[PDB]
Amino acid sequence: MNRGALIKLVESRYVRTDLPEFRPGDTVRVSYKVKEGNRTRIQDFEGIVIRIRRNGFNTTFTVRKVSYGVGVERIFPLHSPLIQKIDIVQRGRARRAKLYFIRNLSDREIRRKLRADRKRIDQDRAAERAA
Amino acid sequence: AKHPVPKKKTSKARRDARRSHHALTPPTLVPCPECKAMKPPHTVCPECGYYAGRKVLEV
Amino acid sequence: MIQPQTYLEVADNTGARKIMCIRVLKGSNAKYATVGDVIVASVKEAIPRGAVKEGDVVKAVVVRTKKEIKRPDGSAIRFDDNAAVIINNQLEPRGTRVFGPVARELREKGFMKIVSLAPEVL
Amino acid sequence: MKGILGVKVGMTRIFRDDRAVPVTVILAGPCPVVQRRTPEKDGYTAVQLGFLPQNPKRVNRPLKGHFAKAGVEPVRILREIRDFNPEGDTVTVEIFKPGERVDVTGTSKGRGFAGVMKRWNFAGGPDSHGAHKIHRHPGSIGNRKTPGRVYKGKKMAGHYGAERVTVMNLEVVDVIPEENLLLVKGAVPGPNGGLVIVRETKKA
Amino acid sequence: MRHLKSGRKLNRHSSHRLALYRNQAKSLLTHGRITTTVPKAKELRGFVDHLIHLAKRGDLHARRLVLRDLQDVKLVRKLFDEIAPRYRDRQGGYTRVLKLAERRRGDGAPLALVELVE
Amino acid sequence: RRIRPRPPRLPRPRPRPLP
RNA sequence: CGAUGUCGGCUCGUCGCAUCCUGGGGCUGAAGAAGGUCCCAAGGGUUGGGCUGUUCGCCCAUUAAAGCGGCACGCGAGCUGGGUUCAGAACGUCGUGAGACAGUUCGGUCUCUAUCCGCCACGGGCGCAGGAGGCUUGAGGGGGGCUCUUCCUAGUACGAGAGGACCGGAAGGGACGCACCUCUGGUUUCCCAGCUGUCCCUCCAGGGGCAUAAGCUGGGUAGCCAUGUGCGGAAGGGAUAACCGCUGAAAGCAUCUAAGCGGGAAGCCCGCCCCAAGAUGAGGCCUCCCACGGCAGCCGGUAAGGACCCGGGAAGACCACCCGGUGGAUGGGCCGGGGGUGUAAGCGCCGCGAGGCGUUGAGCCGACCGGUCCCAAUCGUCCGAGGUCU
RNA sequence: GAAUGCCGGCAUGAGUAACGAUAAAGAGGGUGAGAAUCCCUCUCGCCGUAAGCCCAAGGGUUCCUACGCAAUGGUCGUCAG
RNA sequence: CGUGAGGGAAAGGUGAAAAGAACCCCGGGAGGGGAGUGAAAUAGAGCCUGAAACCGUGGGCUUACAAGCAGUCACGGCCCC
Numbered sequence A: 001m002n003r004g005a006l007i008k009l010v011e012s013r014y015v016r017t018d019l020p021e022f023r024p025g026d027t028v029r030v031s032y033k034v035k036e037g038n039r040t041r042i043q044d045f046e047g048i049v050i051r052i053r054r055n056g057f058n059t060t061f062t063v064r065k066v067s068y069g070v071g072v073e074r075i076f077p078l079h080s081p082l083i084q085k086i087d088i089v090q091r092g093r094a095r096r097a098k099l100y101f102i103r104n105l106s107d108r109e110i111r112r113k114l115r116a117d118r119k120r121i122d123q124d125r126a127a128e129r130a131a
Numbered sequence B: 001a002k003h004p005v006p007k008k009k010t011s012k013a014r015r016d017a018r019r020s021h022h023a024l025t026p027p028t029l030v031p032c033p034e035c036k037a038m039k040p041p042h043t044v045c046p047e048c049g050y051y052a053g054r055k056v057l058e059v
Numbered sequence C: 001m002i003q004p005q006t007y008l009e010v011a012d013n014t015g016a017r018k019i020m021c022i023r024v025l026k027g028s029n030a031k032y033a034t035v036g037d038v039i040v041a042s043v044k045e046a047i048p049r050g051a052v053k054e055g056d057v058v059k060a061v062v063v064r065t066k067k068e069i070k071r072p073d074g075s076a077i078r079f080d081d082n083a084a085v086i087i088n089n090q091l092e093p094r095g096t097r098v099f100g101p102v103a104r105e106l107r108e109k110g111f112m113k114i115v116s117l118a119p120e121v122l
Numbered sequence D: 001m002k003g004i005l006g007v008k009v010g011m012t013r014i015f016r017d018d019r020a021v022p023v024t025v026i027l028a029g030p031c032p033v034v035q036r037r038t039p040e041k042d043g044y045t046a047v048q049l050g051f052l053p054q055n056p057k058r059v060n061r062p063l064k065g066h067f068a069k070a071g072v073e074p075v076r077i078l079r080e081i082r083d084f085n086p087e088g089d090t091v092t093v094e095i096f097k098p099g100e101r102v103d104v105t106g107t108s109k110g111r112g113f114a115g116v117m118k119r120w121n122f123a124g125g126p127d128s129h130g131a132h133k134i135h136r137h138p139g140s141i142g143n144r145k146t147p148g149r150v151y152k153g154k155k156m157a158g159h160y161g162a163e164r165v166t167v168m169n170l171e172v173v174d175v176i177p178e179e180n181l182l183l184v185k186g187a188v189p190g191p192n193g194g195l196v197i198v199r200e201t202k203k204a
Numbered sequence E: 001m002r003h004l005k006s007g008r009k010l011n012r013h014s015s016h017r018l019a020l021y022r023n024q025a026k027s028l029l030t031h032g033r034i035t036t037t038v039p040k041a042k043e044l045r046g047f048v049d050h051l052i053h054l055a056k057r058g059d060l061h062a063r064r065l066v067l068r069d070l071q072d073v074k075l076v077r078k079l080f081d082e083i084a085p086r087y088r089d090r091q092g093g094y095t096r097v098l099k100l101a102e103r104r105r106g107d108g109a110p111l112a113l114v115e116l117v118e
Numbered sequence F: 001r002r003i004r005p006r007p008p009r010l011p012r013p014r015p016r017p018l019p
Numbered sequence G: 001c002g003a004u005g006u007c008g009g010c011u012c013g014u015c016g017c018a019u020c021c022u023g024g025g026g027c028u029g030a031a032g033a034a035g036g037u038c039c040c041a042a043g044g045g046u047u048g049g050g051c052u053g054u055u056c057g058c059c060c061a062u063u064a065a066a067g068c069g070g071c072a073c074g075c076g077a078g079c080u081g082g083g084u085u086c087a088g089a090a091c092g093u094c095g096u097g098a099g100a101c102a103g104u105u106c107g108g109u110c111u112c113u114a115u116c117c118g119c120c121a122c123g124g125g126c127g128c129a130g131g132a133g134g135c136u137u138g139a140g141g142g143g144g145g146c147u148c149u150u151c152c153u154a155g156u157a158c159g160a161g162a163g164g165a166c167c168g169g170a171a172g173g174g175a176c177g178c179a180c181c182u183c184u185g186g187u188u189u190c191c192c193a194g195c196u197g198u199c200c201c202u203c204c205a206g207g208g209g210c211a212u213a214a215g216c217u218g219g220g221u222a223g224c225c226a227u228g229u230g231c232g233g234a235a236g237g238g239a240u241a242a243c244c245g246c247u248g249a250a251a252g253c254a255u256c257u258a259a260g261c262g263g264g265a266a267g268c269c270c271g272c273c274c275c276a277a278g279a280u281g282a283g284g285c286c287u288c289c290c291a292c293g294g295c296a297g298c299c300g301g302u303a304a305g306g307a308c309c310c311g312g313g314a315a316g317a318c319c320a321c322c323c324g325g326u327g328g329a330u331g332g333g334c335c336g337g338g339g340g341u342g343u344a345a346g347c348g349c350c351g352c353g354a355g356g357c358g359u360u361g362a363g364c365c366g367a368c369c370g371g372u373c374c375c376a377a378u379c380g381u382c383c384g385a386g387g388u389c390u
Numbered sequence H: 001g002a003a004u005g006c007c008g009g010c011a012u013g014a015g016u017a018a019c020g021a022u023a024a025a026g027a028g029g030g031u032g033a034g035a036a037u038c039c040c041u042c043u044c045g046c047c048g049u050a051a052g053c054c055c056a057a058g059g060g061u062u063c064c065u066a067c068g069c070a071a072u073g074g075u076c077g078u079c080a081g
Numbered sequence I: 001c002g003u004g005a006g007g008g009a010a011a012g013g014u015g016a017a018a019a020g021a022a023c024c025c026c027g028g029g030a031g032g033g034g035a036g037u038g039a040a041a042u043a044g045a046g047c048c049u050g051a052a053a054c055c056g057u058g059g060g061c062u063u064a065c066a067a068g069c070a071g072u073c074a075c076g077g078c079c080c081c
Ligand SMILES: [Mg+2]
Pocket: B001, D132
């Protein structure tokens, strides 16, 4: 008996692959399936990912954004069927895994703290150049 | 707290009855395969210094 | 999670700036109110010549909470403040605008006028 | 009344119709009938079921002999299901379809000697305002000279958990016959690797 | 409770318990065999085995790693030069505990021996 | 519930000097 | 009176019913809705605040309701000490005075060890006529027992209107309870990182101690958790309470009753969950050993079995329970995976330098899912049936 | 036979509370009838306006060395005021 | 014990005679067992007599479905004379 495997087996049918890799500090845009009345649609959450907690199929990430003066934070299952796509809008270079600390920073400060990850940005442009 | 105290002297009978569980259990001992001395199992024989066939320590 | 003694930012143009919860109107003894729940609240801070004034006891619906609220899809959403919109006894907002985003849950709880008046519905 | 022995393997959530639904995965079968309890012989109606293969080097002669009369390979756990008489000589996960609801019995996690706050959700004392060495104490336990004693069944501190617990009317989310897997929605008593019993629900 | 907790407390606080394992390790590596109470012995197995495995890497990193616990440069040399080579072909389990057949007089503690394996 | 307030029968216990 | 600690609060309750709510009714000056009044009913429920030491009461906001009482005005070897019985001090008032006042005011030592009963938990012993390993029956006992809003029926019945249902159906809640840890959110005493001062190793670099019983800070797996998730209250059957009848005399009529029958409560019985054969009334089934030697007794070796001892465990205070003991994956190591931290040291390059860049998601790395006999569970010992009599 | 009597002896509570600052220990080697506790070594921790050093009160052989371990030392003891 | 005035205990007996147990044995010692003295050694110095509470070893009878001021009256069983 391998309980771990047995779990991963149950999870496998729901595991997703089409999502791009990203790190905390990256500015990302989640395109999300949303229901209202009574049709469904896409709503885009564009903000900085400030946490990624890992548990295999059960990993989840947190995306932070200010909208109309109020900061908002959303948590998504990294394998949520309701995500249409995730677009990398920017690479950020953090020095730690969780960026709760940006909750108390001005726009100036967030910027000087989260300078652009020039290395991984190049990797991005160096990719896409496809045959 | 108001200093509990015994209300009555315990009888010779009742205290000895308490002590019906106080019997020691004799040491559990096996003979040493090498030198045939009695010793506690899973220990290294303090008579010859053998355990699991080989000589392990100076006795 | 709102409870009696909690302060709420009021996100409308009724004139109120701060209200303090004095009761959650959800059954006989709810310990907490969340988004979409209606509370009773004393007005603790208000601007001159508003529709409402400091001291007024009012009803309002929570539209934003700092405690993240979980959705059936396994997602969550969390706000930087606790905010409410002041309403009348028929769930209708007394103001003419609402400021900042509101929780989508308001819609399933029959507060369409607010959802409409909201700049964003996350 | 149907039922099967099984082991709790763990928890996850899956997605179904745009909903997250937490599930406890249960490795259910397969359980061979090793004895059938009949009215004329035993006084009632049940099936003794086996579960999990055992190393015959560990199974004594009286047990070995029992297994033999059923022509069954030595099993670790012998357990009965009341008012159950499957037609097979073997019970599999297939006795459940998804959508059906079940009651699950396990042995709850053991808190050992639990205080009265953890056991019975007592309130304990103030943590300040004068409180003296009674922060987690149970308080009063009685009246005075009348009745001059403590009720039988008085909630007090003591051992808690490691007991038989039956959560009821749990929805079967999915079943995977190829791997003997049962997916039950919600919580199930006891630890991962713990033995469980899964029965047809008694709630209508 | 204690459910699935790993590692003893040995009635010492964190820094004391850490000092303990280090000073025990240093002794084990020094004399190759020591006598302690059985629980400390069982707990020393893993603490030292890691250090031995690290000497089997030999890299400057591992040296500077082991140095954190063992502190003695000459001892680390002996670890790398004389000891680690013996276990090049052994995959873990560089230490053994055998329980002695007598107890301390002063407090009746059960004793065991911890030795570097051949 | 008793209305006429009923007075203390005993004083608050106080310590003695211990011989 | 060789002492029965005294208000209020807190904690923890249990009980009564003269019932606050919810369930069932009759009468109504009951159109409906909403009330009034009485009957039955003690199963469960009976909110959070302001004032005051207050109980009580008023008040704010809710509510299905915010019930009343008993238990030494329940509960200080459970806590509190605001009230009030000491000594200090002051105001009013009384007294020439010392002092005094159901007049006020500020302050003011509440005792680590439970013997017996009782209560919660857990064992050891013997018994249940052979000795054993399983699996069960359920006598008996405990747990639980709450309730609202909206929608449909239907703006129908009813009503001049305002208003507005019965019955039946659907969805969603509050408090509570049991379990759980996938998610959310905690902790996570050394799992990683950064930082200061000092002292040290070995000078640089790299490190270590100490600053708490983590020096400090940012994070944090398993686990244990609630704020998080699942699930429960039932359904249903039986008998009833108040009440309503059917048939029906005594009494040519009438009558729920005297014969007989039916309907009828959140209550009672059962059903559900948990304990349970010391249920000495000691139950049942499946399987194992067996006709021992010696003098319903004793003695000795055994059978099946078990205990010891050992490695351990989401089991646990010790005990118990459970798994494993080389014909083995039990713990320790080691390996892979997970996970955390967030790009180690060294080198090279750019910079006067603090630094930066690359090698690099690097290095480190508790507990989680596994693999692997490298280390350790070596070797053994003692118990343990011969089956009482009609 | 009783005076919460007087003196003494011996029980009960009980193998119970406790063993006096949570600055902290580990191993190796000696000695010895006996060693967690004595000697040595190495590692670790604590004090450092002291928990170091000198003086005065007070104490009055407690100082040094050899030989001892019945009692004293809250355990042990080969050690010691 | 109290600064002091002052308070103020407990504690007798080997045997006629030390003849006070050489020597041997276990033990580090203490202590014991032999030997020896003695009329007597449970007169062995922790010594005349050696009560009682209290503690223990052996033995007979008895006790784990039973309700208590513990006894008393009857009967039965078992053990002893
Ligand atoms: Mg106290």
